[PDB]
Amino acid sequence: YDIQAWKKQCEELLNLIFQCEDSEPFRQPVDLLEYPDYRDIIDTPMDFATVRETLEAGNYESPMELCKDVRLIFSNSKAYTPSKRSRIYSMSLRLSAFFEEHISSVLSDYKSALRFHKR
Ligand SMILES: Cc1noc(N)c1C
């Protein structure tokens, strides 16, 4: 029933994501010099360094807000791909499966703890 435990759990999950070779395209903001019409297609850029900085600054209140920003990394990649068979989009689908597998217990434990706090 620890209401604060999600934050270190998310720190540890982000460390595992940075070690994954599949995170390479997503570790820093998309480079506009490489992809000059990126902002014609994507309204809200997001990347894993921005998620980690937001967590370490104390600017997430819950693991649901961190999960919304990580899901936006993967939705942006789907929207910007020219094909469902592309290399950067194929790395985004494997990394999304790994993330969803690990975030599920973090969300459940936090939501259970808040329900106990409010009982
Ligand atoms: C850049 C970039 N971001 O996502 C994809 N799918 C590409 C290409």
Per the structure, the count of domains in the chain is 1
Nearest protein Cα to ligand 1, atom 5: 77
Q: What is the resolution of this structure in A?
A: 1.2
> Determined by which method?
X-ray
Give the chain's length. 119
At 52, the amino acid letter reads R
Q: CB-based burial of residue 4 (10 Å sphere; 0-12 exposed, 13-18 middle, 19+ buried)?
A: exposed
Contact predicate 73/103, CB 8 Å: no
26 Cα to the center of ligand 1, angstroms: 9
Cβ pair 27, 49 in contact under 8 A: yes
Alpha-carbon gap, residue 41 to 14, rounded angstroms: 27
CB atoms within 10 A of CB 16: 12
Q: Which atom of ligand 1 is nearest to the CA of 26?
A: 3
The dihedral sign for the CA sequence 47, 48, 51, 53: negative
Closest by CA position to 14, among listed 75, 66, 86: 66
**In which domain, by residue range, is 63 found?**
1-119
Given a contact cutoff of 8 angstroms between Cβ atoms, the answer to whether 109 and 94 are in contact is no
